[PDB]
Design a protein around this ligand. Sequence first.
Ligand code: GCP
Ligand code: K
Ligand code: MG
Ligand code: MG
Ligand code: MG
Ligand code: MG
Ligand code: MG
Ligand code: MG
Ligand code: MG
Ligand code: MG
Ligand code: MG
Ligand code: MG
Ligand code: ZN
Lengths: 36, 133, 122, 177, 418
Amino acid sequence: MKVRPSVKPMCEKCKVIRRKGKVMVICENPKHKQKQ
Amino acid sequence: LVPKRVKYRREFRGNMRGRAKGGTEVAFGEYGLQAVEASWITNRQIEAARIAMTRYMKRGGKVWIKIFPHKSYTSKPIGVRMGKGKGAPEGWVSPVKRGKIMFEIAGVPEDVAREALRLAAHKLPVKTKIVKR
Amino acid sequence: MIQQESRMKVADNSGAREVLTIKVLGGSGRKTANIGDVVVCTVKQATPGGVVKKGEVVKAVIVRTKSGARRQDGSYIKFDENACVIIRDDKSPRGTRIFGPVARELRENNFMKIVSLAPEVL
Amino acid sequence: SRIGKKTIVIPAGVTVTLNGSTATVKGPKGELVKEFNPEITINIEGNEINVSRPTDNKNHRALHGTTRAILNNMVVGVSEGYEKKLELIGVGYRAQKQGDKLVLNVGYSHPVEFVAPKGVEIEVPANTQVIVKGYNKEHVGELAANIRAVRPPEPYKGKGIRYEGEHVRRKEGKTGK
Amino acid sequence: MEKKVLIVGISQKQKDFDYSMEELANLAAANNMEVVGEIRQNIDRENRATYVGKGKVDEIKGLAEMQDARLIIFNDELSPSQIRNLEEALELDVMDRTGLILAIFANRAKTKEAQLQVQIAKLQYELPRIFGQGEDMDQQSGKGGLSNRGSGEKKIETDRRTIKHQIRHLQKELDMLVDDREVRRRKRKKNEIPVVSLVGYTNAGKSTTMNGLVRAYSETADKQVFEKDMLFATLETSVREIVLPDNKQFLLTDTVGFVSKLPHQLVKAFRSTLEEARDADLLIHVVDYSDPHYKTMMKTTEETLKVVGVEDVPVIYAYNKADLLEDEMYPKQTGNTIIFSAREEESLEFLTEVIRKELFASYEKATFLIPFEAGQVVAYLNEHADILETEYLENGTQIVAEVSPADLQKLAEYQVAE
RNA sequence: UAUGUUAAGUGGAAAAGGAUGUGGGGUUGCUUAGACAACCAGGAUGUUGGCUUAGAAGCAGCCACCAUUGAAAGAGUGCGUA
RNA sequence: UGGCACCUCGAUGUCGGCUCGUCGCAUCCUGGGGCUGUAGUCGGUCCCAAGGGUUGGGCUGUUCGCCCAUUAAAGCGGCACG
Ligand SMILES: Nc1nc2c(ncn2[C@@H]2O[C@H](COP(=O)(O)OP(=O)(O)CP(=O)(O)O)[C@@H](O)[C@H]2O)c(=O)[nH]1
Ligand SMILES: [K+]
Ligand SMILES: [Mg+2]
Ligand SMILES: [Mg+2]
Ligand SMILES: [Mg+2]
Ligand SMILES: [Mg+2]
Ligand SMILES: [Mg+2]
Ligand SMILES: [Mg+2]
Ligand SMILES: [Mg+2]
Ligand SMILES: [Mg+2]
Ligand SMILES: [Mg+2]
Ligand SMILES: [Mg+2]
Ligand SMILES: [Zn+2]
């Protein structure tokens, strides 16, 4: 996981979702997992 | 960007009240960066923004810089007290009021222009927007 | 009870004769060592022409102490001197001969060659 | 809610009753009972169940949809049932059972033991194949997930316990040269 | 603008003393400065107080005030007392060779590794000099007496402690950066790719050689390395793949150049930087054969390699600039020496042939029989080894090729005895 | 009291930046001659287009991107093989 | 590291050590986890976590530092530099 203030997509399969009131990115590539 | 010569080596800092006097419209190119707030902008910041936005376009099109650093500012070193005259000049600055267009570009399509201006605006201490003629 | 700065007489064939202890191994705040413990140490006197030289940093096992050991059946043993044997990274001696009596506790700690080379195992 | 508006056709042999907000479903395979919020309402007749939506705002829409889905799954599970399937990949990876106790040899120094709860059963067609069966979606899914979490698949050889409907992301151990 | 400077030197029993002043002028011309006059003195020993003696100071001051200079540059490292004395006598600004090299390095440091290295070198250089520099304020004579309230220390202790502290912080950041750097070498070390490193003097032609080799034998050949005459052009190391026509792979590295009379505070930075050359598998020493002084350069080159700590590595001495010389034939190999011109296809072919001969010498003949339906191994052979001939048999494919011991062990089942 | 907004205890502390939170407006595309989402079926032939390569069969890379039946069907969107 | 001169000049004892600690977390060890240029071994980086633990000497008045030998580890700061 990457914990940054600037979560945004890194490729064209990344998806931006919200869980428990946090913005995050999920993807097939595990290197693209981000949480704000 | 430094003036070749000046009449005086020291100058008041001034203020930034009001909307920009002139230069609030795109006049040479198709695209421009507009200031939304007021700020002092140094020549290092101008140079960094220019290099970023010029490198993205691969030396295609044309770029106009619409602000010049006419004013100088001074400083005092660490360990000196107050008094004993004014300090020594350090750098050159341009006071930019809200509404001023400070960079213009032409000769490239929408995408290249907008992305170059976005890359440039991240080097500047002021809040900006992108406008088209 | 051997702690740092205590000196011991060397009871084997190597060139050393007297040794000063530098560190008791086996824990951060450990202070004293007993029969069957390994110490780091330095050679203070040596026999000219031997394998171990003066000023060398070595490690050794204590084979008899002046405050000895108690056995589980309720008996005790004590000696008139403190003595050590210079050893390698494994538990093997660096000499070919061992002098004086050695305590039986060396066998429980698996110092087999020292036990077999001794004149007497008490 | 398109889901919330759909009709539930009751199969033969299963009976559904309402005690206030509580709902009870019976049939050939078992009995279910569950509590929903009173703001939604349900009609009852011979062979149709309809859940209605008083209001059009957000949470109310979501609750309508999920209430319909839960009723559908409950009735189907009572009537036909539910199952999940599990595979083991790797040398020496073995699945067995002694009575009502699943025993897994998945590469540890000890075997791993599982016992099913009430309403759920475990079946072992082959030494490298497991099946979880029951009339409750949540419990079957939870037990299959718990079994799979013992030794999840790994990307360098594919070894572990996985669903049949899993695609494992595969990596190469040595690259660059 | 451009500053006017002077350069001052003593014979000091140096063997040349002329190339030293020439390269000092070149270095000054590489710092946006121009030399408007040099002073030399043939004294066999250095003066203890002013480095040139009493009369030479007046002569230097007169020349500076006639040529209108702003700074004086001395050919050797100065002493803090020497600096104080010269500054008081000349009423100008004084700077030495170490300061000049540090100034050159500071403004060409882009990556923060170089920036931090130059920062620590500058602070280490200025740390001993602050004594008399700060004593002028500190030696105020009148300060007080016994006070029953105070710091319990003298000001000299306090300022010594303050200046000592920050050095440790900067060095700590350096160490953390180098440790992070060792992470990126994990893949290279885990595999066993041979590595060959280019070393030599400045402006020898290392970067041009690397660029030619990369254009000849790389997949992403568009990745070029900067080249120019100027001065210390490359301040960073680069690593690239090279794949030979006979299907062999190695890595080529490029490092920085150095010059004679090198500061000791910066040789630590070079020792940090040349850590890739230290663990190299082969060394290529580029020498500018055209320059008459090239011989001297070679010696000082080994000296640098003796200090950073690279030894017992096979070295091939390559003499560049063969085209610039008349009545010479190239490329040619003599012992462990190569005569060639970097900007030549044939010279690069010869150099890569020499490299292949030197590195790979355990690739021997072997024959394999790969069954048809159990295929997918001929592809490995063709993309990991050089073949000679293959045959289409009824039972499979009969290949013969020259391979490495690892391939032999991996393909031990397919070997056929004769 | 009337009409709205907010779900953070914001209210009751702090920026550049980041974001399918939520409400109100204004434009525009398709749609009961059936739109969007799922489900069923098809998704073909010259032809493995040419070059290069030991290969390259849509899917290492370069140059081309036509035609037929037909409702459409890419000289191929991605995975996969060597 | 500095700037200012707001309390104290009918007195607010000032460095290092010893004795005795207590608190913060921006975590040195130990506990849980995500990513890896994670095959294994050994590591790197980030998230949760302050329960407990966190060495003896040579030199120097020294704090700091260098060195010797250990340890799971030899944390960084506040408390009138406690
Ligand atoms: N006539 C001739 N000129 C050459 C030859 N090889 C290189 N040169 C010239 O010498 C120069 C070499 O510069 P370069 O290789 O960048 O020097 P460098 O070794 O990188 C200096 P640094 O150590 O700072 O990187 C080039 O500009 C090129 O024009 C050659 O074979 N013949
Ligand atoms: K901005
Ligand atoms: Mg004793
Ligand atoms: Mg003693
Ligand atoms: Mg005095
Ligand atoms: Mg910002
Ligand atoms: Mg909004
Ligand atoms: Mg559809
Ligand atoms: Mg008073
Ligand atoms: Mg001491
Ligand atoms: Mg340890
Ligand atoms: Mg404190
Ligand atoms: Zn992605």
